[PDB]
Amino acid sequence: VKTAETGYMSRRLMKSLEDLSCQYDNTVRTSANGIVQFTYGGDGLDPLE
Amino acid sequence: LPDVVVKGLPDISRAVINIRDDGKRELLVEGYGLRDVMCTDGVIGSRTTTNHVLEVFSVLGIEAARYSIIREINYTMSNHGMSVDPRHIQLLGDVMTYKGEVLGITRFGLSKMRDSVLQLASFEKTTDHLFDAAFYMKKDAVEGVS
Amino acid sequence: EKAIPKDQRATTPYMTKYERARILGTRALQISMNAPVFVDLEGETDPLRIAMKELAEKKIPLVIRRYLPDGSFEDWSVEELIV
Amino acid sequence: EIALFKYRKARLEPGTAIGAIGAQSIGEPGTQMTLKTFHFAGVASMNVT
Amino acid sequence: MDQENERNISRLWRAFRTVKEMVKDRGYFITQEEVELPLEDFKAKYCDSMGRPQRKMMSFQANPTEESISKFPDMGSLWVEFCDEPSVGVKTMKTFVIHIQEKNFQTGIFVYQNNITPSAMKLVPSIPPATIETFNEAALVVNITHHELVPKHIRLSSDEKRELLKRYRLKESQLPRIQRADPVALYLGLKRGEVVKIIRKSETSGRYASYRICM
Amino acid sequence: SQFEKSRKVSGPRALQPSQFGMLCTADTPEGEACGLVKNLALMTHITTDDEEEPIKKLCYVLGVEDI
Amino acid sequence: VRYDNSGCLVKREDLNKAEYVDQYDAERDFYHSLREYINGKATALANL
Known part of the structure; x- marks a missing residue:
């Protein structure tokens, strides 16, 4: 029964966290340039690196 | 008549007092107030935290609602392993409440x-x-x- | 709409991994349309492979226009950017 | 030199779709849930989700 | 019964602490003797000889502390009062509005007692320059700001808002919004178009600030 | 077996202890019909309605009163 | 350089904690942590 819910929470969470990218002024914004967070995580560090 | 309240808070089911690892006693209820519970003689109104995010939002505000939602997600995942490197949780807890209301x-x-x-x-x-x-x-x- | 001059550039002087793949694909799409190369390539095919030889030598005649969200052009030539 | 190079490469690069990464990093550990009844209480005092 | 009059005077004393802390947080001159007075300086100062608390013996006036004048030229004094009846009708708040219009008060906050009638809420936009705030004595027992979860909210000036929007190259619409009738906003009295600064204390990074704008 | 709705079922898919020797405790399909489709064991027998008439007249002989 | 949100610089005796916590604070805190890590080696070398 888990195979019927393989992506239902991840697709609904993808509806809002989709058009967010960091601009060249180190600010993460939305598609309509409305700013949402001034620096990423309070420090601007990539959690991958 | 035999279900009329006498003294206490009306929107709390029950209460359990619990012991930590040290010699301290902490009570816990299962209600919905957080204002009349915080305004109670005997307890201190310094720190108390519920699971309900809108209950914190109606009493504390917007900025104190995101700081609870970045740790309630952190609590329901660190009880299994699976580190989600909490900057992701802070990004989740900021896109829900950057409009002045938790929706x-x-x-x-x-x-x-x-x-x-x-x-x-x-x-x-x-x-x-x-x-x-x-x-x-x-x-x-x-x-x-x- | 205003173009930032060279002495007022405020962005990072490094090359992003997102702007390494687009400049390489644009160079490889230009080479596949019979553009003259500027590298001593060994005899081979696949313009995506001989565009990496130009990127490793830094002889690509392009620049990377970096737009800020009010119009702040900020030219940023490729050879100025280091890998 | 090592401590400055590993910090200067660690910043979040401009243009990273950081909403799409954060939306999949949360939902993908969500798809491995069994029942797993736990409790934030003593000897089976409360059933918490 | 005197048992209901021994601990219910500390219910109003703890709110009397919160009103002093709130008028201190606005940037008004208060001293460190009226906010740190013990129970011995409150029994024979505010209540009756029989044992009940008085009503009209709470109202005082606070002036700005000679630095917020330089930060804000268009700001004056307030006039905090206290109820006489458990349910405010007409004549007492008409006396309050005539008092504010008479003695040249730019604002004044009103502590309320038990339960709000709908005949008293249509008059709250009375004076277009001078606004008033309607609190509740059950919502002023505990203090919201230093709980565990509320960071340091700091109201900025019109000279500091101009420096923020020029440095980020923004407008007033891009900033994250905060609503009216919020327990952070009505504690500090934010108007429409005022940027507040928030100093968050996180774990992965530490201490960092952000900015909100009020609607 | 037939379901009512496939949203919040959660009940008729676990193995009941009351099917010991009646239904097969191993052979179930793997997929959407997991637990909804069952099998009979070896020594079982599904019965039929016989008469219902002489059993009621036999209880009255054994001592029960009419209602 | 730390600025107090209204133009010019901050005071010299206002750098530990203030109401003017700006950006570039995690980077200088990382620099102070690296200073503290280097100081831990010389302290052990002097104690040995």
């Missing part, structure tokens, strides 16, 4: 900022978001990836 991801939740009609047409209960978009005459500048 989640539901049918009435995707209408927080997205002016895009076709992005909002990728959800269930269709044939009602197109007609009011054609009635109120949305300008709908294409900017989103959807």
Whole structure:
């Protein structure tokens, strides 16, 4: 029964966290340039690196 | 008559006092107040935290609602392993409440900022978001990836 | 709409991994349309492979226009950017 | 030199779709849930979700 | 019964602490003797000889502390009062509005007692320059700001808002919004178009600030 | 077996202890019909309604009164 | 350089804690942590 819910929470969470990218002024914004967070995580560090 | 209250708070089911690893005693209730519970003789109103996010939002505010939602997600995942490197949790706890109100991801939740009609047409209960978009005459500048 | 001059550039002087793949694909799409190369390539095919030889030598005649969200052009030539 | 190079490469690069990464990093550990009844209480005092 | 009059005077004393802390947080001159007075300086100062608390013996006036004048030229004094009846009708708040219009008060906050009638809420936009705030004595027992979860909210000036929007190259619409009738906003009295600064204390990074704008 | 709705079922898919020797405790399909489709064991027998008439007249002989 | 949100610089005796916590604070805190890590080696070398 888990195979019927393989992506239902991840697709609904993808509806809002989709058009967010960091601009060249180190600010993460939305598609309509409305700013949402001034620096990423309070420090601007990539959690991958 | 035999279910009329006498003394106590009306919106709390029960209460259990619990012992930690040290010699301290902490009570816990299962209610919904957080204002009349915080305004109680015997306890201190310095720190108390509930699971309900809207209960914190109605009493404490916007900025104290995101600081609880970045740790309630952190609590329901660190009890299994699976580190989700909490900057992701802080990004989740900021896109839900950057408008001045805590509204989640539901049918009435995707209408927080997205002016895009076709992005909002990728959800269930269709044939009602197109007609009011054609009635109120949305300008709908294409900017989103959807 | 205003173009930032060379002495007022405020962005990072490094090359992003997102702007390494687009400049390489644009160079490889130009080479596949019979553009003259500027590298001593060994005899081979696949313009995506001989565009990496130009990127490793830094002889690509392009620049990377970096737009800020009010119009702040900020030219940023490729050879100025280091890998 | 090592401590400055590993910090200067660690910043979040401009243009990273950081909403799409954060939306999949949360939902993908969500798809491995069994029942797993736990409790934030003593000897089976409360059933918490 | 005197048992209901021994601990219910500390219920109003703890709110009397919160009103002093709130008028201190606005940027008004208060001293470190009226906010740190013990129970011995409150029994024979505010209540009756029989044992009940008085009503009209709470109202005082606070002036700005000679630095917020330089930060804000268009700001004056307030006039905090206290109820006489458990349910405010007409004549007492008409006396309050005539008092504010008479003695040249730019604002004044009103502590309320038990339960709000709908005949008293249509008059709250009375004076277009001078606004008033309607609190509740059950919502002023505990203090919201230093709980565990509320960071340091700091109201900025019109000279500091101009420096913020020029440095980020923004407008007033891009900043994250905060609503009216919020327990952070009505504690500090934010108007429409005022940027507040928030100093968050996180774990992965530490201490960092952000900015909100009020609607 | 037939379901009512496939949203919040959660009940008729676990193995009941009351099918010991009646239904097969191993052979179930793997997929959407997991637990909804069952099998009989070896020594079982599904019965039929016989008469219902002489059993009621036999209880009255054994001592029960009419209602 | 730390600025107090209204133009010019901050005071010299206002750098530990203030109401003017700006950006570039995690970077200088990382620099102070690296200073503290280097100081831990010389302290052990002097104690040995």
